[PDB]
Amino acid sequence: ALTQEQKKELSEIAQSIVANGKGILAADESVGTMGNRLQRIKVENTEENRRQFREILFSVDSSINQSIGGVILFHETLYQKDSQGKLFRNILKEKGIVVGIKLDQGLDGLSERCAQYKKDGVDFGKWRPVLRSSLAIQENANALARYASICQQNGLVPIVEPEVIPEHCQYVTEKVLAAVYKALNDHHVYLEGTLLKPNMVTYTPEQVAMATVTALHRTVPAAVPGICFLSGGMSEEDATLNLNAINLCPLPKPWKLSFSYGRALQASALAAWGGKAANKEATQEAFMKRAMANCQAAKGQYV
Amino acid sequence: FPALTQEQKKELSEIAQSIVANGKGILAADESVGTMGNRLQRIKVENTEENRRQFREILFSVDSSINQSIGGVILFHETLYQKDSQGKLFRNILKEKGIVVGIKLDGLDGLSERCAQYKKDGVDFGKWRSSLAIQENANALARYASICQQNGLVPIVEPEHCQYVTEKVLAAVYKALNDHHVYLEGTLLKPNMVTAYTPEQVAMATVTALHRTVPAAVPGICFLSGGMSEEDATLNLNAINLCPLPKPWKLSFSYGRALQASALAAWGGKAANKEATQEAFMKRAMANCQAAKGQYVHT
């Protein structure tokens, strides 16, 4: 379904996102979500408010391009502009961060819909179908794989997220995954030009990491260049300990074990902003801390 | 309802790894009654029982330093019960010269019991061989799988552009296994060599395939040589080990023709050429122990 070229691009990007213990940032919080978030620190869920907190993020020192490989965006954000009229879309394309687009059971028209984003500054997508049976599994999976196979046609690296929202977890995770990658091998996907955002099998980070790797190394091929875990609910310190642990786990791991965090990278930064554009530096620090912290968990050198 | 208990796994894995542990490979001493004959036929021998037994006695009794290039030797039913010219048992001769013994199960029917036998006789690992076809054989190999492991043994998953095919088949095969809840870690894989070319390519395509389908839980992948001349089976395995792709698993060899061709031709039936045979075999044995470690220099 591809030409050497198309692959070269897909792989070049997939790897370039996790290249050196680098991870992925979630700047795709839905319109409501962002409000539940900004709510915790009593700021209104207004376009501006969002554009602002985010302007902060993407304006940190150009050394951030070392802990982050790419930032996924929510449609709106992906067309928002910084105080200078510059597109949040090019501010990243500069430093060296790749822009992603939260696409989300939306198979129809997600072709020319992608081809758009790709040519707007996005290079990879992100689709999600929740899991916690036989007709679902095979579906979400064959669904994923379907979705994925398109992005390839539209120079987009697809991050597959067969998440299993909250050891018994292992068995499940393994099966789901085993279906998922099988599914992909059928639609003749290009694993090498893929990525995987699996949940983190949730116990001490050691164990939590153990079970997790065993599962992945039992199912996810060595052709997938990376496995950026999502933190979904883990406190900023736990998402780091576990990713770290996962990287120290004594199992084979033919693939970059990274992070694709949102809450684990913002919680502190966002709480330090609280809407007062006067705390810009404070926010950028709580974010620089988490960004670096997890860049270490990704190379298992964190402590 | 898991097929095994922490222990049972420990054993299965301990063996699977112990077979490929240090660039060590697997020997095919399972040639069928008919097969063996065709072989013995080239050297022009009669397909007796004895004739066979001796040739083999020669191999299995080679310099105890052979246990540095071979981790396991697969066997044909009859042989597992033959005795060297000293009444001693190959079953033990090989188990003493540090080499795990394998049994050919080639037939899904009432295999369990059949295995449980072998396991307690000195065997610890075994063998066995369009969308439809694939699924059947897939789910087939999965049964042969689960059963072996119920009985301490280790299933040697042996699955049958050749890339595209190899990948699909394999992708079905390992999926199949994940369903019957097999213990990949206590498994092994004898995939053919993704081939029609330089061992550089022949190896490339091959690895890409495997690393695209075979999990990192499978401790090893002992290729079969089926047809490659003794030198090609060595170059390719070597090449495969030098290929620049991730390879979370021991890439070994599970050869027959590639280890005997020369040795057998040096024996020709004359028990008087015992040393000559044991050399042509010692050469291939070591030669491929290097390809397994991609340390094989080919003058």
Curated annotation (Swiss-Prot), chain A:
Cross-referenced InterPro entries: Aldolase_I_AS, Aldolase_TIM, FBA_I
Catalytic activity: beta-D-fructose 1,6-bisphosphate = D-glyceraldehyde 3-phosphate + dihydroxyacetone phosphate; beta-D-fructose 1-phosphate = D-glyceraldehyde + dihydroxyacetone phosphate
Presence of the UniProt keyword Transit peptide in the record: no
Phenotype upon changing residue 128 to A: Loss of enzymatic activity. Impairs the interaction with G6PD
Presence of the UniProt keyword Cell membrane in the record: no
Function as written in the Swiss-Prot or TrEMBL entry: Catalyzes the aldol cleavage of fructose 1,6-biphosphate to form two triosephosphates dihydroxyacetone phosphate and D-glyceraldehyde 3-phosphate in glycolysis as well as the reverse stereospecific aldol addition reaction in gluconeogenesis. In fructolysis, metabolizes fructose 1-phosphate derived from the phosphorylation of dietary fructose by fructokinase into dihydroxyacetone phosphate and D-glyceraldehyde.
Protein name: Fructose-bisphosphate aldolase B
Record organism: Homo sapiens (Human)
